[PDB]
Amino acid sequence: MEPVSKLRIRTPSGEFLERRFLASNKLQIVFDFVASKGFPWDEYKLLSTFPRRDVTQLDPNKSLLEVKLFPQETLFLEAKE
Amino acid sequence: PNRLIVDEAINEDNSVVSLSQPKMDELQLFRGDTVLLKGKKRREAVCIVLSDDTCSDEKIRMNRVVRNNLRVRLGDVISIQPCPDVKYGKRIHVLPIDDTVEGITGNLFEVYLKPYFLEAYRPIRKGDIFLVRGGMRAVEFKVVETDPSPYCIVAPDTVIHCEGEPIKREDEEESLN
């Protein structure tokens, strides 16, 4: 038993990515996930609703709990320009 | 679709409403999900749901703007349900409300409208009236059309049309708060 973080992520086409993470594990894991699903770090931003934050611009070396991503959050992807 | 009692907001952003954590779980809602709200007179709204530790399980925290669109007051009852189906907007048309643009300064779009939507996730519904902060005043706009309709999320790519003559505020468009 250990703190877990549930994430949901809207794609630019309206689909949803869902996955549970370890609240303790580094942000980088998240970045890798989205990359894995076809949305590479250099092309897509991962965004929060309110407050508005560029998740992918947060410290990758920081835990999910550290970036207030706990216990459940919906995020969305946006193309970089 | 469950009903909750209306309470004051701790967050004035017009796009957001708040619930208790337990409430959210019951509803299978996550922080940041878009929700479909129903009020009085067949009125509706789309919002982002947030968690809030100061919120009673039996209530929802809801800004004036939202309250107005829903024709509800503090202590009234609304319905809430998840709305993940909402699509990004292609095009929208908005118009300023006559009585809120008397002697405005600067360009309507650039000063007032654009910064509402710029770098912001804004779920909108047809017939919505929303308030902006630009220019030391309080301009209001009405959503007169959307594609898609009636609901959409205003995205960076969304074409925002504002041109046209200021509209008269309708009877059931008066502020209740």
Swiss-Prot record, chain A:
Residues 2-77 form the UBX domain. The modification Phosphothreonine is found at residue 11. The modification Phosphoserine is found at residue 13. It comes from the Eukaryota. Most abundant in testis, slightly less abundant in skeletal muscle and heart, followed by prostate, thymus, ovary, small intestine, and colon. Not detected in the peripheral blood leukocytes. It is found in: Nucleus. Ubiquitin-binding protein. Required for the progression of DNA replication forks by targeting DNA replication licensing factor CDT1 for degradation. Potentiates but cannot initiate FAS-induced apoptosis. This is FAS-associated factor 1. It comes from Homo sapiens (Human).
UniProtKB/Swiss-Prot annotation, chain B:
It comes from Homo sapiens (Human). The keyword Chaperone does not apply. Belongs to the AAA ATPase family. Necessary for the fragmentation of Golgi stacks during mitosis and for their reassembly after mitosis. Involved in the formation of the transitional endoplasmic reticulum (tER). The transfer of membranes from the endoplasmic reticulum to the Golgi apparatus occurs via 50-70 nm transition vesicles which derive from part-rough, part-smooth transitional elements of the endoplasmic reticulum (tER). Vesicle budding from the tER is an ATP-dependent process. It comes from the Eukaryota. Keywords: Acetylation, Amyotrophic lateral sclerosis, ATP-binding, Autophagy, Charcot-Marie-Tooth disease, Cytoplasm, Disease variant, DNA damage, DNA repair, Endoplasmic reticulum, Hydrolase, Isopeptide bond, Lipid-binding, Methylation, Neurodegeneration, Neuropathy, Nucleotide-binding, Nucleus, Phosphoprotein, Transport, Ubl conjugation, Ubl conjugation pathway. Phosphorylated by tyrosine kinases in response to T-cell antigen receptor activation. Phosphorylated in mitotic cells. It is linked to Inclusion body myopathy with early-onset Paget disease with or without frontotemporal dementia 1: An autosomal dominant disease characterized by disabling muscle weakness clinically resembling to limb girdle muscular dystrophy, osteolytic bone lesions consistent with Paget disease, and premature frontotemporal dementia. Clinical features show incomplete penetrance. Frontotemporal dementia and/or amyotrophic lateral sclerosis 6: A neurodegenerative disorder characterized by frontotemporal dementia and/or amyotrophic lateral sclerosis in affected individuals. There is high intrafamilial variation. Frontotemporal dementia (FTD) is characterized by frontal and temporal lobe atrophy associated with neuronal loss, gliosis, and dementia. Patients exhibit progressive changes in social, behavioral, and/or language function. Its main location: cytoplasm. It is found in: Cytoplasm, Cytosol; Endoplasmic reticulum; Nucleus; Cytoplasm, Stress granule. The PIM (PUB-interaction motif) motif mediates interaction with the PUB domain of RNF31. GO terms for cellular component: ATPase complex; azurophil granule lumen; ciliary basal body; cytoplasm; cytoplasmic stress granule; cytosol; Derlin-1 retrotranslocation complex; endoplasmic reticulum. One of its GO terms (molecular function) is polyubiquitin modification-dependent protein binding. The modification Phosphoserine is found at residue 15. This is Transitional endoplasmic reticulum ATPase. One of its GO terms (biological process) is autophagy.
